[PDB]
Symmetry: C2
Amino acid sequence: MIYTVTLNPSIDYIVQVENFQQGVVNRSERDRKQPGGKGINVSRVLKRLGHETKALGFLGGFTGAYVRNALEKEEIGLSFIEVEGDTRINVKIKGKQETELNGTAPLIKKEHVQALLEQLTELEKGDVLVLAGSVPQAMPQTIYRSMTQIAKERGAFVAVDTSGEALHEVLAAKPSFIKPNHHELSELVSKPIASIEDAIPHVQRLIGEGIESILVSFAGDGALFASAEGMFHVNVPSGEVRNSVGAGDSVVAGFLAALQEGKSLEDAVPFAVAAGSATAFSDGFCTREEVERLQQQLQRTIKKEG
Amino acid sequence: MIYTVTLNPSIDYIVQVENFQQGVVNRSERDRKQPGGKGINVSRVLKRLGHETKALGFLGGFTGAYVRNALEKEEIGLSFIEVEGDTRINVKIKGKQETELNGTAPLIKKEHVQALLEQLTELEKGDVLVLAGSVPQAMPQTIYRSMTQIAKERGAFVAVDTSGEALHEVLAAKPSFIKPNHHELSELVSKPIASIEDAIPHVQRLIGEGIESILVSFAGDGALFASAEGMFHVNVPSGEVRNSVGAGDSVVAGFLAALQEGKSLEDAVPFAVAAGSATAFSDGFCTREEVERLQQQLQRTIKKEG
């Protein structure tokens, strides 16, 4: 049904140290590690929302074994291609400041990329393909455009959450749904967008260019959703954000979980934004209960637009 | 024959990064992962110098599995005790400002910190017990004092490489060898130090309390050795130090390797100081051939003390 692709998964090593300072021996007070990567995170959250997914991508070494074991324990569908190097270890330092340091991508022989593309020919009509995250530089940045084509030639629904050249490249493939935050969208059109008004003309050009739906977040300023069927705004429940290591991925899962449940593209927006917020407010990720709650609240702030 | 103890072992994650800012992101340019822990390093460097050893300590979690697999490949003797906790990960960032980030020590039950002491009971006359590295706050900072005893009461040679209360409390136990750098010595004799003479009176008193040998390195300026047979100085090879990760652990391994091969306490010093700077003048752990060479260099640099 729903397939997620994570080209560069990882072990997110989350560490809070209210004292983290350069050139010095920092100790940790609170340590945690969890499998990471945008595709993987959409899977995990989907699971928490009661939906299965089959996770795809590349995994290597003991760190990859850790990632595979974990998803296994969470009873999440998976079919990763083993690679030679080790899966990267990403370091997330919380506390006073918020500093990140990503590990190097592991080498991926061309045969593996060919095998990953091979798996996609398995998508059937009505399946969903989620391509989220960065594309290792060693790989053709047009990779998502390729995977989207394979998917579309099989009737599969494509949801994309990337940036840079990779996102620019995917457009010609006309995926079904994209979710750029306002900064990613500004980067895509090479123009600044700070308000809902700044984005509307561009969104309208994208829908007419074949993109079926788009959801642009403006952080604590709500979200804008456009479909050839319409355009409207929605607010965020507001609250103290206790975490921010997979909130955009939650929005994607929420949207897709709702679509699975038969709701309409428009009707799904409320649930997705809430899922993002729920995760943004809890130490870990959102729960089916939390989302439903917040969603009820947001399902009114719905202001038309366009 | 030579036992090493590592209470808080770990996987050392070295990541080279330039212009390693803060608050934002940071992409590694080069990564590296290997077993960490002072005792562990001593066993690894001893292996390279041609000598076996059995490493003891506490490992847990997939991280602990890694440590164990790696040492088993280097064919290093071992017998750690599995604790329900997850061996830590210390992120050693390098560049123009090598920083560090030590992970939260796992969790060790009493019966564990007891089956260990229980292992020491096998020690025999002529054996060697190496105690190095800080102590997990989850344990009493007197733990080395306690082990030295068991060890000493068995004709075993105890060498210690620590600092802080831990180092302070071991003294009354009368260990056979300690290597406080000129600083740790100030942090011990609770008094500042500087001259090569500003330490002899104090290294003298320590020897008089029952401690067999003391090796105190003046960072960049040489090192002083003291035993009941008198003392002498030796200068450091002098060269470009690329790595520091495990230099002190090398002087210790060198000193022990040299005594294993029959050489005397004082005659083993050159060899130990050689292993130290041979590891430092490199991007990895020193090789036998390297030590022997610089050994001769330092061999001539020998001056008795007044």
